[model samples]
Target chain A: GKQRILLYLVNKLNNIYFRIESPQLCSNIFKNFQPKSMLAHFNEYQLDQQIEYRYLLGRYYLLNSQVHNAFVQFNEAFQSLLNLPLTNQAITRNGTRILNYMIPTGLILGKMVKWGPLRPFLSQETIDNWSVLYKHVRYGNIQGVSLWLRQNERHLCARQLLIVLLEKLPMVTYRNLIKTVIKSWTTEWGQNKLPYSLIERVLQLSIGPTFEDPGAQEITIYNGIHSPKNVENVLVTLINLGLLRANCFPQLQLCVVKKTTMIQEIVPPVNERITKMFPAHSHVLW
Target chain B: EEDDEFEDFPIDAVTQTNIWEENWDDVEVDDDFTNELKAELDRYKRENQ
Candidate 1:
């Protein structure tokens, strides 16, 4: 009786929550309802409902840009779905769902360590292309990035996967590499308040002959030292994310020194708090 | 036949690893990566202070 009532609530909640796009309200309903037990019940039946739940939760996390959390859910659901028989209707249905989420999630995360285990679940072609893109972004190979973008132009636009890859650079890349990206971004986005000389100095200090190939002299020149507004936005995000710190002046000039300590000591406690919210014993679906 | 079908379940493999495997129980974040981050932060703080 309880399971039946819970299922009814979950169905109603999912319909309304998705229609409204209110993650807070949907999460609250899931929190109060404990849909994990219901999903666990479905898991016992081999009905593929558990896989569906994982996929839905993965979507939820993805929408929030919580790619790491999303990665875990998609990986779990995909692996389980793969183990099912090809003849089973659930395999075909859920297999498609898994691939749809897995490919983009792999691109967004873009590290062999993160998506390595899921290699067997994806096509060799997709795995090869995605890994190449991953390596391009990992090493900050600007030429490779542009080539891949041009080659996969139609496919790239539909998913905004390229933009995601570009944005994710700051989190995993070094300060010097990020500054190099900023230099290139200036040419693309047009002018900025940041003076050309300052940008040049930063670039020079960041990229010496030893750092990159001396033959790649074109990267060193300033086509336009223009500072786009998004640089500030990106810098602000990195600062908030505890990745970097720098004082920015109007007209987009920046202090080259990066503060090793994050200004926001508040972030760690918040991370701890979220981790604490899910107790080790709780069976609730997240 | 049913036994063979059940044997193929990926439960063990699925549960073998995940994001929370290392950090679930301990409050002290002792991993090498986090330790390095913390050490850098400490050095920065000391220099700035």
Candidate 2:
């Protein structure tokens, strides 16, 4: 009866772990479910029990921001959960549970998942939650993402999806904006040069929220010859990654964008750059 | 203050004058994008070397 006892304790562990707001909890507390034990007798458990185990393990990884391990476990659970008898109520109950965690997990990691595959198991609200979140991220719309965060703040926090959405998705938005600005500049003018000030300008526009009649407008990039070095730093990162195809000149305050090296190189787009950034725990995977 | 845990994989040498290779954030959408980037980069550089 070790399996039964193990399963029961896991369920109890989940209940306690579910209180994500208990003064900055750590996943280490759950490490007692030793990885060695899971590996030794993992597959020996029944299918549903195995799936439950997968979810628990996935949450453990997720709490630690280990998206690679997190997503794999949930995906495995999703695949296994489908194999159970269609008439079982557990399928309906746990299927929703799996998608609830899995969808946000995928979206926050920068992977726009095939929502259709799991559509039937989700509520329109949560579906729409990601729908708009992705849209905001897709278009590099920072204000839009901020609005959604405000709108769905509590909802995401409850699912433990709030932290990454705030921390990770905004970075994706910046990537898209940086790529788009340079692409438009290159395509239209037939010139590779773009100003750092221009990037600072666009970055501000996306995140622009106004306070109206009396605040004395402030700028993120300071006045001429004394502007902040932040924009150029991003350009430096873009150039290093080969995503921007350019050289950043802080003195000149602009990027001299380049065409690809002809031998065997191609600059990747924004999406790929993001996916590559976190090569280990890719949010966007098949 | 965190660092880019992974390094970049470029298809070819993106030739630039003495460009440095580095790894790649809570972003403040409307706040000081430039200063923040410098802060993070500076912190990363400090910790590593």
Candidate 3:
């Protein structure tokens, strides 16, 4: 009778928690009901209870934008699944689902592709997608990537890593495109120096036509091409992310490019320990 | 009557009333599976080495 009441109550609370879809609410349900305790009691009797509880909690963390905690839960869940000699089909499916979400999200957040004993368990397609994503980001192909993300968004909807990547795209795109423009300008003019007008021209050429049906209503000022203030914010963001080295001259409305070849290097880890020890801030988010 | 029954109940039963008082650390749902996986991996490592 006691166990029944607890399960009944936890189920009701779990439904309510998902309906509202708040991280704090989800964690509160776990705290108040102590479902983990109840589930732990009954775990010896059932297979599904053992895996589902951790999987649900991992999903909760992932939804709340706590990828680090989510990764730990998913890792444990996967390890548990591997231990089973004849794993349940549903459990295996759930395990794959979790990995599909984890791999890209981990890479986007700067985790490498090395899973110690768990490597052979993952599908080849998953490994392929991870490699492709790395190449796209490494080369700074925002145009190709934007379309690729849109096409694959359905598969990656649960992870939401695409949204984060898209947010980081503008900075990545601007840095690469601007560098190319500077190289061309220097070759043509035969000097490193450039006026603010040329800078505005390059900025417009890079970002202007990308926006759909751009007009004066889109936001324009100094050159009737694009918004100077918006461009300034992008430049400032680049400098802050340490993707570019530049000196801003706001009074003169000029930005002198110092280093153009700055790109984030993905050092292929020599071993599993190094990949496992990646820091949180190293991963770029949109 | 309720008080009488409560008084007659064993002292150990008191701990069972509140679920939180039980030491949950000893119990783990995935212990068997995790142990098996570890053992298998160890065997594989030894073979490879």
Candidate 1, residue B13: Cα displacement in angstroms equals 5.9
Worst 10 residues of 2 chain A by lDDT: A219-228
Ranking by TM-score: 2, 3, 1
Predicted structure with the largest lDDT when compared to the true one? 2
Candidate 2 pairs with clashing backbones: A111-A284, A230-B34
* Candidates sorted on lDDT, descending: 2, 3, 1
lDDT of 3 by residue, A1-286 (tens): 3564453345445545555634356566565534455435534423334344455566676666565556556555555656644545444555566566556445444444454343454666666665555444433344445555666776556455556555534445455445444444443333444456554544443333443345424322212322433656666765655555566777776666543232222112212222244333311111
Clashes by residue pair, model 1: A192-A227, A193-A251, A194-A251
- The alpha-carbon lDDT assigned to residue A211 of candidate 3 equals 34
When just chain B is superposed on the true chain B, each candidate scores a TM-score of: 0.41, 0.35, 0.38
Evaluated at residue A181, the lDDT of candidate 1 is: 34
Q: Over the stretch A1-286, how does candidate 1's per-residue lDDT look in tens digits?
A: 3454344345445545655635455566545535554545644544344555566666666666666677677767766665544435434544554665566665444334344445444467876876665555444343444456557766554443444544444343333234333333333322222343433433333223422354433442221111222345444554455444344564645534322233232123222232243222223356
Count clashing residue pairs per candidate.
3, 2, 2
The Cα RMSD of model 2 versus the native structure comes to: 14.1
TM-score, candidate number 3: 0.47
Every prediction's TM-score for the first chain? 0.50, 0.75, 0.53
Give the alpha-carbon lDDT of every model: 0.45, 0.56, 0.46
Q: Candidate 2 at residue A64, lDDT?
A: 71
